[PDB]
């Protein structure tokens, strides 16, 4: 029983829910709203469909914010311990970025010396979680956005002051008998959404400092990245603090495994974000994205799967009980009944990593040799395109103004615009269907493609993160500059039709490049022919990313349809009133083809304004 | 169209929801679970009914925590501004108590200056919102609970370290693909629940400092308390920072109302908690509780209703549009479409209060004289029983050991035990039905009755918060001591059959008295014949109160049935496994009579253990 199966058995899923016409915020419920048939028009409390549809959308964003923030808070606490001599398993693999950061956050570095620079950053970052002054914007946001944007959101009161405080006041204002005005609720949601970005930036930057900002690297994707002769260990989740250490400890045991009868040694494969984290920095091959995370077990060649936080199906234990596979959970706030828990203490990272990998080297000799079945499918992929890497490549075409070439080409027409693919894998859409057709769709129209998360995972497996992939679908105008830069660098040919910018949080990598280009033109993102698209979004996190994408200024496309249609006022606010208030807006459309046209249309419309 | 009407139109409310067998945590949903008919047994993600039922219960608690905490955070920030000279509208009152928090901590007291400590307390309290050390318990909790409890919860990891952080990590661990283990989820819920208490204590104590710890006072309840000769202004919500100032400015504006044609002047009536706040401290009469908050408008004699935060029906504007009544909202995170917004700036409290009251003195001359209709119903009530007041009364019977008499009588049998009534008004139960029958039920069996919130509002209107009320229902044993203390006190006949201990947050007033008695006996609450009951609970806040009531050690009764039955594992954890782990447990029963018997049975069982 797979995810696709379970999905089928759910059919037909509740219509009231899908419409957002249901509310279980209090026990006087569950109240539903009859849109037409003049049945119930209000909740027992008096709440109307507009209110009802609004609070739920908002709480979904807050939850997404809380998911990302918790990822960041973790790394921020790591810096703190580092700048205090603790956690001797983690260092500053890139004092350069650790330095650039300080620069941006107004943190003095001059003759100071690392651990004080590591420490202040930790206090500022952690500050974004403790500030009680509703009017003091979060540091990272105020420091990382075009000054024009900071000025705009600030006047609208859409700039958050505290990540945790934002999630909480969001849940607090949507309690029964609280914030009911549709407009006020949606604005509050846009604000918490900004707290998601803040946490995302905070998390990406500091992550680069701890493990190294990613640079171009070749890798592989899909299940066909599992050695028959190797101990296969999959890492799935979002926190790199564990996976990265595992990759290190893994190599160290390039022997113990061989001993246990592992010819090709230890073969760790990634899944989702944490997988994207190690695939981005190091060569580590990506096994698969969200919906397909169970399929690796069926292979009958997966010794163990180490999971940390979020986007881990609770079904894994069961599916695994059918084989030898071990489902090892690691976080206190992330346990799954059936899995075997091995608390990951960062202060004892390497030590815990070894225990876990050992558990795998053991389960290896317990593997059924006659049940193995590993698809040949092994799509090659070129990943590791951090905002730095991108500017670094543009340097090899103009070391004085790396942005010059990029600016020019968009002005003449070679590059019509840029599409940022972010998002998940919904069952209400074919695995990686929309992603591929939408990418090719716009890439032909001379639109540059950037992708993160599972969306990026899709393109990886699809083979669009390839040099030739560009030579085969990139409309001339685009294909031109694409190959120039690529050649100007160490890759036989052009850049990938799709550039892998990292995990979900790494969407800030895109926000950074965008703001850089935007400042060069002395303009704002709400002016660039920059567009966002989430073809198969599903999670509350995804819903958050999309919301701030819209508040940053980008026209955002969602191909899943959030619980909004049940309310026209709300549907209006987020797809029309947003165009003014904040410049960005949502574009709901479940037809890839239709979406692409609306997207390109927006890119073209943005063009006009320049 | 009233709340009762809207409720009817909702009938029959979804069964899946009621059962907790539905999940809209991500877009791959909404997934529902078919309990029997072997339909869908899992969510498209793999989540099972146990998981599904658990995350929702937890997130409800987190939301409740966020509601209460936000109330506290507000007052804590007020102290901070106070200890800095800003906020020239507010000050202190009753310091002998301000040093009952300025002691309930490593508070540096002795000759240091008040407006210096009304800042240290502010830093500690605010600390409970910023601490990033998962292992450092919140100050107020560690300082206000029996040391035995602190030791117990601490070993179980059920002691929160940061209120806001608790809500957020709660939302984070229940995101799709996160914490799925039923036991782990419920434990995490119990912890966030403790963050609700922390916020509640934090909020009550500091509130007493700012406006005066409540002492016995006589008052009135129910609509009747209104008056055509007066300008009627109702305050509804939870934050006393506004209402209290209004009561002052109200008296002030003398030649302002009478002039406008207001014979009896300005008559401000309360509703819910904020109403309980001013009814507790000052004589301010309570108009009504939750479900009946709209009825005051129909009276046709309500000039205006000033609402701040939470438990304010979104229907008020509409209902009011039929009259002259003004629905004035005041908080940025609490707007209702239709109401007229008047931002309440504390730095300009008195100034804003005057604007609002003026708006009322105006709407007064716009009142329809031929549509007025104010019920005669005006039940008298004796309220203001803070934990202090209770010990103060017990002093007048033994100034050496105020607790002595109280301890003794429970040991001999005069007082079988104590029931704490907390909770709301659900439509799935008659207005204040269960409350009254359950109160009399146990009071006959010699059980002392304490009540807060709307539950307490009920008893107020019912007339059980009366001296004679005791002479008429209190079983001898109880009735005995009840009258002794009452007589010994400077009031009149025996104490009220039901003692009003304040608003929802003031449930800590009860936790305080309980812990005091518990320490005297050198025992824990999980040992006292102390029991909690929420006959008509409805809100996420109520669900939180109940959860920590259970974690503190009390056997808690809920008469609404949270979305739990759909899961036996969960139902088990919170009503059986809790008996061990933490000593308290839930007692779900929708039949007042049946409930009372189980309650008294638990009180009796607790007795046995002593
Ligand atoms: S969304 Fe609401 S109405 Fe639909 S199944 Fe879930 S609880 Fe029931
Ligand atoms: S908050 Fe209002 S609409 Fe939602 S369940 Fe409660 S009564 Fe119904
Ligand atoms: S989290 Fe799981 S059970 Fe809940 S809606 Fe999503 S797929 Fe369904
Ligand atoms: Fe992710
Ligand atoms: Fe309340």
Curated annotation (Swiss-Prot), chains A, B:
The domain comment in this protein's record states: Cluster B is an all-cysteinyl-liganded 4Fe-4S cluster; cluster C is a mixed Ni-Fe-S cluster which is the active site of CO oxidation. Cluster D is also an all-cysteinyl-liganded 4Fe-4S cluster that bridges the two subunits of the CODH dimer.
Family assignment from sequence similarity: Belongs to the Ni-containing carbon monoxide dehydrogenase family.
GO terms for cellular component:
cytoplasm; plasma membrane; protein-containing complex
Which residues does the record give as [Ni-4Fe-4S] cluster binding sites? Answer: 238, 273, 311, 424, 454, 504
Task: Name where it's found.
Answer: Cytoplasm; Cell inner membrane
Q: What is this protein called?
A: Carbon monoxide dehydrogenase
The reported result of mutating residue 238 to V is: Great decrease in activity; diminishes incorporation of nickel. Displays hydroxylamine reductase activity
Give the record's GO biological process terms. generation of precursor metabolites and energy; response to hydrogen peroxide
- Residues annotated for [4Fe-4S] cluster 2 binding in this entry: 23, 26, 31, 45
Protein source organism: Rhodospirillum rubrum
Q: What induces it?
A: By carbon monoxide; under anaerobic conditions.
Top-level class of the enzyme under EC nomenclature: oxidoreductase
Pfam families (UniProt xref): Prismane
Q: Spell out the disulfide connections.
A: none
Q: What biological function has been recorded for the protein in this entry?
A: Allows growth in a CO-dependent manner in the dark. CODH oxidizes carbon monoxide coupled, via CooF, to the reduction of a hydrogen cation by a hydrogenase (possibly CooH).
Per the record's keyword annotation, is Transferase included, yes or no? no
The record, for InterPro entries, names:
CO_DH_a-bundle, CODH, HCP/CODH, Prismane-like_a/b-sand, Prismane-like_sf
């Amino acid at each position: 029983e797979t995810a696709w199966h379970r999905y089928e058995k759910q059919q037909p899923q509740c219509g009231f829910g899908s419409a957002g016409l249901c509310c279980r915020i209090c026990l006087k419920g569950p109240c539903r709203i009859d849109p037409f048939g003049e049945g119930p028009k209000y909740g027992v409390c008096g709440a109307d469909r507009d209110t009802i549809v609004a609070r739920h959308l908002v709480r979904m964003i807050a939850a997404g914010t809380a998911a990302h923030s918790e990822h960041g808070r973790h790394i921020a606490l790591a810096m703190q311990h580092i700048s205090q001599g603790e956690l001797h398993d983690y260092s500053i693999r890139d004092e350069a970025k650790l330095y650039a950061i300080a620069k941006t956050l107004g943190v003095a570095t001059e003759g100071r010396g690392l651990l004080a620079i590591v420490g202040d950053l930790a206090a500022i970052t952690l500050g974004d979680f403790q500030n009680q002054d509703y009017d003091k914007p979060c540091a990272w946001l105020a420091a990382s956005l075009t000054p024009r944007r900071v000025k705009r959101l600030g006047d609208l009161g859409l700039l958050p002051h505290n990540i945790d405080a934002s999630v909480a006041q969001t849940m607090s204002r949507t309690h029964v008998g609280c914030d009911a005005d549709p407009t006020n609720l949606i604005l509050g949601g846009l604000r918490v959404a900004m707290a998601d970005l803040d946490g995302s930036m905070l998390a990406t930057e500091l992550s680069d400092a701890l493990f190294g900002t990613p640079q171009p690297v070749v890798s592989a994707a899909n299940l066909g990245v599992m050695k028959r002769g190797a101990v296969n260990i999959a890492v799935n989740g979002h926190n790199p603090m564990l996976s990265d250490i595992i990759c290190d400890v893994a190599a160290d045991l390039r022997d113990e495994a061989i001993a246990a009868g592992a010819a090709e040694g230890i073969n760790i494969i990634g899944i989702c974000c944490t997988g994207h984290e190690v695939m981005m920095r190091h060569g580590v091959p990506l096994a698969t994205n969200y919906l397909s995370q169970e399929l690796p077990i069926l292979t009958g060649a997966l010794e163990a799967m180490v999971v940390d936080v979020q986007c881990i199906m609770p079904s894994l234990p069961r599916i695994a009980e059918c084989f030898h596979t071990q489902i090892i959970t690691t976080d206190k706030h992330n346990k799954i009944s059936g899995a075997t828990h091995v608390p990951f203490d960062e202060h004892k990272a390497v030590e815990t990593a070894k225990t876990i990998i050992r558990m795998a080297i053991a389960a290896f000799g317990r593997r059924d040799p006659n049940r193995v079945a590993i698809p040949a499918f092994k799509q090659k992929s070129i990943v590791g395109f951090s905002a730095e890497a991108v500017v670094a490549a543009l340097a090899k075409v103009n070391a004085d103004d790396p942005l010059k070439p990029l600016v020019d080409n968009v002005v003449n027409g070679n590059i019509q615009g840029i599409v940022l693919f972010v998002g998940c894998n919904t069952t209400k859409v074919q695995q990686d269907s929309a992603y591929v057709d939408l990418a090719k769709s716009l890439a032909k129209r001379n639109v540059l493609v950037l992708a993160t998360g599972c969306a990026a995972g899709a393109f990886a497996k699809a083979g669009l993160m390839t040099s030739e992939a560009t030579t085969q679908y990139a409309g001339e105008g685009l294909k031109g500059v694409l190959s120039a830069i690529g050649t100007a660098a160490g890759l036989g040919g052009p850049l990938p039709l799709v550039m892998h910018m990292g995990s979900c949080v790494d969407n800030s990598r895109a926000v950074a490049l965008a703001t850089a280009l935007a400042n060069k033109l002395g303009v704002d993102l709400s002016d660039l022919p920059l567009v966002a698209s989430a073809p198969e979004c599903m999670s509350e996190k995804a819903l958050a990313i999309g919301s701030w994408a819209v508040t940053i200024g980008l026209p955002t496309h969602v191909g899943s349809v959030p619980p909004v249609i049940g309310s026209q006022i709300v549907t209006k606010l987020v797809t029309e009133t947003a165009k003014d208030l904040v410049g960005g807006y949502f574009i709901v459309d479940t037809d890839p083809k239709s979406a692409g046209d609306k997207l390109y249309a927006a890119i073209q419309e943005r063009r006009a304004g320049l």
